[PDB]
Symmetry: C2
Subunit: 614 residues, 2 copies
């Protein structure tokens, strides 16, 4: 009643030299489940990777055939689906929405959402999940569905377009033996429609072999047994190792392979008996209209991408402002280190005066404040490396572009950066007593938000060159401490040596720290040294007010000027010349702060161009 398909791979030789696979031939129908078995890395996978064309063309030789005719990689990516050995899903997003996000990414948009809603409703019944249709997927801290019932969802994402041939790389690994049965029970329920399934089971159970209809055993790139599980007693009995009854088949037959991994035993005594066993059982058409008949059966619901790049952006935004709504303790940890640091910094540096020490306390406030923006965003390396393992899975199916992923991941962090930036700028502006009034408050809000923007762009760029969270945190703290050393606070710009001046200008803390200094120390009325404050902290300077004016009028008798106690010697424009903060305006220091944000999002896109292509 389905349309009959025949996949028949032949003479596969995969070399890398290594000769990792050597002369594997096979045949599969629909209705059946071809299971490929191996011991611990025998080549069970790298045969699933070889039949899905996921290795190389040229390093594999051998005709892969479907319906008795040749097969190229253009047809096997609209017709097939490879299910990786993971469950990389978002921890929120209940399982009607996980499969509806994967619906709109991958099913074409010429379909209405009305037909697309029942395709997910057909799939949610074909899978054995209706108790979990309204419950959260639920990672280790927010438990919401079962472990082997997550597996039918990640399997179900890849069958959103209802493929014909379905490659699965160990779909029952890490599952208990009674939920791994219902995985293979719904897999044959998929295969009871017009579907070919080539999966690589690691050590099947006993109740599962009511479903597997054809087996292949591999010993380091050589086939050892190839046939039905009913012929599995009759094969091993005729080889010289009979089978114990009332005992689990396909386990006795599999560790007997492993005992022949000895020094002189060898499975080479099995590879030519496998060649003589095939000879004794010979007892005795335009696939694109067979595909077109199998589209009209109801399969193959699925262009390079199924959406333009302005619908993949609002699908990836809606998916991540809904995954982040349902756990508001990520913006309760990036906000309880901004309110907490904003309360500490505003009460230590409470109402700083116009003193020579209060000037040096402003530079110490502005360097500790403008480094909080770069550390606060470092507490997203858990979630930034949580996706890009989901992105690397979803771009194998061409669900969205990599350009459309960076532009959507930059957008959704930005409403949570505006609220962190005016929670630090409301706390530490009227308490520290910063200068500017209101147009100098809005610049303080702007440069906090632009330092959150380039500090979250820098650590989303590193999350994309690092493999794990803990390595990409001890070099986030190490780089953002060398960015602070070179900001011009610890050592000024004109005192940094010539061989280190390239890294002064490449510092991400240099440009916001120099922007809050010109926002604060540019006021012609504010005076930090007034006349008889000239002699304060030198040995000349512990005098009294009486002889200070004779000391000050005598200086007036030496240059030709007239200096009094109302002369306003050191303004705010001379504080900046003492620090070397004279090369750029505060808006050009706000431009380079934003322009280093956009640099690590173009450099992030190029590391998605390399690490996903390789």
């Amino acid at each position: 009643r389905p349309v009959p398909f025949v996949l028949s791979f032949n003479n596969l030789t995969y070399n890398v030299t290594k000769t990792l696979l050597d002369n594997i031939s096979g045949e599969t129908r629909d209705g059946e489940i071809l299971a490929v078995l191996g011991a611990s890395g025998s080549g069970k996978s790298t045969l699933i990777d070889a039949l899905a064309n996921r290795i190389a063309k040229g390093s594999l030789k051998g005709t892969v055939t479907l319906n008795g005719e040749a097969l190229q990689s253009r047809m096997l990516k609209v017709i097939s689906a490879y299910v990786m050995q993971d469950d990389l899903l978002f921890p929120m997003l209940t399982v009607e929405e996980t499969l509806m996000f994967a619906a709109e990414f991958r099913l074409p948009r010429s379909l209405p959402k009305s037909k697309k809603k029942l395709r997910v409703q057909a799939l949610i019944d074909q899978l054995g999940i209706r108790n979990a249709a309204k419950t959260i997927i639920g990672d280790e801290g927010h438990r919401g569905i079962s472990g082997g019932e997550r597996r039918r969802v990640s399997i179900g994402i890849d069958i959103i377009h209802d493929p014909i041939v379905l490659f699965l790389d160990e779909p029952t690994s890490g599952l208990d033996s009674t939920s791994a049965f219902m995985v293979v029970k719904v897999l044959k329920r998929i295969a009871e429609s017009g579907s070919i399934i080539i999966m690589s089971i690691h050590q099947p159970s006993h109740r599962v072999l009511s479903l597997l209809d054809r087996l292949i055993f591999l010993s380091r790139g050589h086939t050892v047994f190839s046939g039905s599980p009913a012929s599995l007693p009759s094969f091993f009995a005729g080889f010289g190792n009979p089978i114990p009854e009332n005992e689990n088949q396909t386990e006795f037959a599999l560790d007997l392979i492993r005992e022949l991994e000895g020094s002189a035993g060898g499975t080479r005594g099995l590879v030519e008996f496998n060649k003589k066993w095939q000879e004794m059982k010979k007892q005795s058409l335009t696939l694109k209209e067979a595909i077109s008949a199998s589209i009209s059966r109801g399969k193959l619901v699925s262009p390079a991408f199924a959406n333009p790049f302005w619908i993949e952006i609002k699908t990836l935004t809606r998916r991540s402002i809904l995954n982040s709504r349902r756990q508001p303790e990520l913006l309760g940890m990036r906000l309880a280190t901004v309110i907490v640091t904003g309360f500490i910094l505003a009460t230590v540096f409470w109402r700083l005066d116009n003193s020579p020490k209060g000037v040096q306390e402003r530079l110490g406030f502005f360097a500790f404040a403008m480094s909080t923006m770069f550390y606060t965003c470092a507490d997203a390396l858990p979630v930034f490396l949580q996706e890009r393992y989901i992105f690397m899975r979803e771009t194998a199916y061409n669900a969205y572009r990599r350009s459309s992923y960076v532009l959507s991941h930059a957008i959704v962090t930005f409403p949570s950066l505006i609220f962190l930036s005016l929670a630090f700028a409301v706390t530490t502006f009227w308490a520290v007593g910063l200068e500017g009034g209101l147009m100098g408050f809005l610049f303080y809000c702007l440069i906090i938000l632009a330092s959150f923007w380039s500090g979250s762009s820098f650590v989303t760029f590193l999350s994309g060159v690092v493999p794990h969270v803990m390595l990409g945190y001890t070099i986030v703290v190490a780089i953002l401490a060398y960015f602070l050393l070179f900001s011009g606070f610890f050592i000024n710009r004109d005192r940094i040596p010539q061989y280190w001046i390239w890294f002064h200008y490449l510092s991400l803390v240099k440009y916001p720290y120099e922007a809050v200094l010109q926002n604060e120390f540019s006021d012609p009325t504010e005076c930090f040294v007034r006349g008889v404050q000239l002699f304060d902290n030198s040995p000349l300077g512990e005098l009294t007010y009486g002889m200070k004016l004779r000391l000050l009028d005598s200086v007036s008798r030496s240059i030709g000027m007239r200096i009094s106690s109302s002369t306003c010697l050191t303004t705010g424009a001379d504080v900046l010349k003492q620090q070397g903060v004279t090369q750029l305006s505060k808006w050009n220091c706000l431009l380079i702060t934003v322009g280093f944000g956009f640099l690590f999002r173009i450099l992030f896109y190029l590391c998605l161009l390399l690490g996903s292509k390789n």
Copy 2:
């Protein structure tokens, strides 16, 4: 041929109220394996915790009986061993040494090591590991033995004293079905000696029921089936649900238990049939000399602790200076952030002059240098939380004291802190051009080592109040940044407000930063402002030198002193009074740096006193 033991628990009611267990009766022999089965938390464990007295006395009611005699917790800790559901071993330490460290901790020291070396040799043959007797245990990055051959070592650690009754909490979880067979094969080989084994399997295989001799099934604290696995077809057939042949028993009979966890099915229809099935099968000695006869058989090789506290210190030292030699990339990451930061800090701050800016660059060097000591030791939170999960396992068996664990963990870090402290002090002393000569170099070496010691003691104290590495790193960087803000570098001591002065004095960076300042700025010959350097960076200060002497002679005609270009106004003793660094000597700032190291190792011992008694 062994000494016959019986264990016979009766009428166990465990309440917490909850009534987690009620009226569980049973009986076990030596020679046999009692397996307790349940679905997903039925009470299979917390019956193993109930029979090992590992929950509460008073919240458990019911007599636990051995050899027809009562049993108390003093006897079941010399006679028994509880095997937790983990494999927490050191990743190095090949398996002849892992079991020989557990030998010397737990076997008594009146034994010579000659008998103790063959007790490990008898155990390594009783276990099925002789191919792995000379290979490293091998964690995920440095693989050396199998996944199921780690399980026989962690099981083997707890049988180092060769107990009689052996409780195992899921000893075959996370194992493939053919290495989990050899776990239960060596368990019955242990049980073929005079050993009682009460283990709680999760969904056993088919080839394993040749080894289990008695079963107990639990449904939310109620026994359901209790008997041999041979009687497991005959029980369910007489209940009303017959068994399919050529199919795995104890899996059919266990998912049928989960089927009766429905809305109106209930396993209460099984609990009184379990009361009538026990009635139909009744067709039909001085324990402490039975133990004494079972010592002379060769069991019970095993005082509160088996060693005084000066041999537990050198056993824990030899175990960790051998685990750390075999991975010298832990002291190649704490040393490539000290040579790298030492090379960066010594080339930015290369040869600082006696200038008003070079004085402020010394305080910025000394505050960035003395904070490197506290961050470099923060890259040990992976390994500090790697043990204290091995310590919490090994103090259930009284292998070592918790006082003897802190004193041994402080000792072995100290030869790696001396080498990091003179790699930072050789790099950044003659390049930055620090003052003191040679007796001011040895103090620079001392206060770097005392800040490594204080900052490795602070993060070993937090590793002991935090549950995981990633939480105990974003609050290590956050606290050691607020320690740096309050050190007196960003805001001075006499400018910190009165409500924040308690945290200035509690700052761990305050005392080494103030110790390198008095080591540097205490020299009566070094001068930072000389006579006509009085007017440098004021509006007075863009003058010419030719008139500056009469600008300075006019000062001399205003106080009564005589100032010239050789007066030496600002020495190093006046730099310290301008910073407020006047309250303690440099040795009393070195004492409090060491005394905060010893405080977070006494506070670490108290958090091992709380979290382990919990």
